[model samples]
Target: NPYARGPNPTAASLEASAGPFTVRSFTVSRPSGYGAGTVYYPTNAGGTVGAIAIVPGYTARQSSIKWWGPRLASHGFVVITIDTNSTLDQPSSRSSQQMAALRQVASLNGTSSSPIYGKVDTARMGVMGWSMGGGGSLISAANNPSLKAAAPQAPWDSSTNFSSVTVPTLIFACENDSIAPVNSSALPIYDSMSRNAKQFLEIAGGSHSCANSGNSNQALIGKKGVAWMKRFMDNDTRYSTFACENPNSTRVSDFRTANCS
Candidate 1:
């Protein structure tokens, strides 16, 4: 696809801490609608890249999910990690802030004075978050079906009825999470979406923080997240195996996917 920019994929390449591209970042001086944001992008992505916005969980800040910024940006995508106006903001508010962060990133693409000017392909965008922010990612996907992809971790929503979500989604679930248990929260949300591409990956023996920053399974989680975004957002079938096939790794307790082929 014209959107695909990186070299061929491999287990080691996707699992590595950084991808082939060199990455650079800048902090937004005045974030538009979100409380704060840090934009990350590839210096030589070779073309305008898709953008992704990520937010932290309840009572959390951007540092909690900052790992994804450089990780995804190094893979030829523009990424933003944001802090909501209030740490206690609920899913709805987080969703709004997440989209607002994306909007600001799009705006930066055209702001000649901005570091990221002309770096983004406004037509392609994705959403991601952790815990309550994870729930926000789902809300964003449901409300904005035009979004290319959604990947949320330890998502916690009051309601699990996301049957309306059509954006391709990948959910990272903690197998033993008490905060947002897989059975009650993640699984049902995964099961609720039947119309679009979706995947549920449960980290074995994990707590709610398993998929958050400082988690031990970056190799697997990073591969899956990047693969999913590349596959859905860029429509790059080269990532089909990495995105759709079960990893069968001991780090993962369960896996389910549909409509990926």
Candidate 2:
């Protein structure tokens, strides 16, 4: 890959400076599926960039997970953060809207009036979210294995039946989450996934919202997220070290991976 190592720096690169590309922000107001949302992309990434669609949890709007936009976009991915068709929707409904947003992003890539026209490589994609939206992200991955990657943080699913997923997945489990306990939610969901590229990250002393904006562990969380997406979505091996080489840390309660690097 052109950026297998150098050109594109994922969140793991963790340089004090952002990428060379300047990000542009816009809104997506869908007519039917969901409420309006936002898109952020690098205007000078020099070529097509991979895209990711992110969703927020139940009763949450884009604001809950909006921080991911600039964080991921600055790292070289076109990012879309969406509001569910119904804030009260279940994981399945949230998944549908998330995919709808990705399709819209693909369509926008060819729309001449859009700033991101031709800037997105639709084939390179990923999905991520928090809480029920996190569970919804897993649903998106299981239902669409072609998606390069999926990351769910402090996730919760109504059922533990995600056994058919094949996409590379990373589960961000919160050890102290009250809403979605690690044992009942994140761990079970991660265990049900059979993909050889799956990984599980347990954040010690974390709450349900531990990995969101302004978390103290952003350096670690963001780095892991960027590395995971870059490795799977962009098929960039340069990130293998960032993605696979986890050392023991007091901050990380439990870590596991399969077929990494």
Candidate 3:
């Protein structure tokens, strides 16, 4: 299932053009507890801004989440995309590695010597991820004070320690995902999160890879994800239109029917 391609071609094309945004790919100074991985950051103009640390799905590159960078930046936020080693076949070490990556991004944002310094508004930060990385994101955001919001798409491990997460969280699940069955993986986690501003969206006819670039499903969910981040980070309601505007009504089923409000 991890190898399945996205559903629509046009969506893939849109992902490719997502950014004229600047990107700097760099190696992590220390190997993540699991192993070494590259990290990509979308550089933004110097100014006060919010930041989002994006953790990619298993075996997926940071570019897979590239479609989200420009859109978030357009809404006045800086995006950091992470490359993770845990793929569908290898999932054991991801939790630690994800936390390592989050810490690394947080440090980068706070340090004056870091490129993100001064540009990132530390007060408003968010975390996002896909598949296994999504599960990892949940774990990281749970305990990280720096994360003001989180969006985990089709998470693999629903046994997340929910008590650690105190910020607003959004969970996007796929009806057809084999890796993380909606009932077993996504719902349990959603049910456990400490009731503070948490929402869940279950998109029918979508699989685990639906959230990746080059897919129409991402176009549907990505907009919602970005809007949630904006609401929590910037308190800007103007972007609310993007929250639940699913274009292909057939694809979305009952769009925004979940408890995301």
Candidate 4:
């Protein structure tokens, strides 16, 4: 059940390129026997330098985030992406899976051979999620200390109070997304995290799938997402090449909004 359908070529390519990284695809034990997609580790035999757990949105597969897994690996962090039953018509169950997955990732970090295996810099660990997964990321980050940073793209709702999240967080919202309106979702989370180091980026003309690879609009926000991971997870300030004052900067609409409030 953990396998889902079959091997996603994109995910397979990422797994192959992640030398020394071990990908653990397993089924999440849910009350209703729903199968979840999960990926873990990087190719670094030296063990995990840092870690990230990615939660996918409704109808999104682990393959959808292949673009991010390798990117995080390149920066020396083991990234785990999981499909949390978003396809089962149960968003609540999917949300719960996100929290469970975070605990699972932390548990892996504590185990031998896990990238973190005493090698991970705990302070650099974080989480990133897309759409509905973003909502779960906010909930988990607020409750988990191991989650030091969070980057959520076009999240679901803003009503969820994020005042408890004391760590740095970043939110990416698409100007045109209808499923998770920028003003109601990303803006509120950004505002709630004001006491923390927080930043928001709204990509004009971006859509729900803009965070995934192979989308024309992805270029507008994908690079920044990569840079954020490097800066916060790898401690690589040199990542400015992709994030700081770049030409693509103009494509991004708003960095601050009343909703971020």
Q: What lDDT tens digits, residue by residue, belong to model 4 across residues 1-261?
A: 211111222312322323234443333333122345444444443434666777777787777666676555553565667765445434345456765665565665577754345544545567777887787777767767556567887877435577888656778888888888777777877877656656788887888776775555544455566555655555454553443433336667778522121
| TM-scores of the models, in the order given | 0.99, 0.93, 0.73, 0.72
Per-residue alpha-carbon lDDT of candidate 3 for residues 146-195, written as tens digits (9 for 90 to 100): 67778888887647557567677888888788888877888777777764
Model 3 TM-score is: 0.73
Candidate 4: Cα lDDT at 162:
79
> Which digits, one per residue and each the tens of the lDDT, describe model 1 over residues 166-201?
999999999999988898999999999989999999
Query: Deviation in angstroms for 218 in model 3?
Result: 3.9
User: CA lDDT, every prediction?
Assistant: 0.93, 0.82, 0.63, 0.60
Displacement of residue 61 (Cα, Å) in model 4 is 2.3
Judge candidate 1 at residue 134 and give its lDDT.
Answer: 94
Q: After superposition, how far is residue 151 of candidate 3 from its true place, in Å?
A: 0.5
Cα miss at 228, model 1 (Å)?
A: 0.3
Off by over 4 Å in 3: 1-46, 85-95, 109-114, 158-164, 240-248, 254-261
Which candidate leads in lDDT?
Answer: 1
The runs of at least 3 residues in candidate 1 whose Cα sits more than 4 Å from the true structure, single-residue gaps closed, are none
Best by TM-score: 1
Lowest lDDT block of 10, candidate 2? 10-19
Error of 1 at 26 (Å): 0.9
Q: Tell me each candidate's RMSD, in Å, in order.
A: 0.7, 2.0, 7.6, 8.1
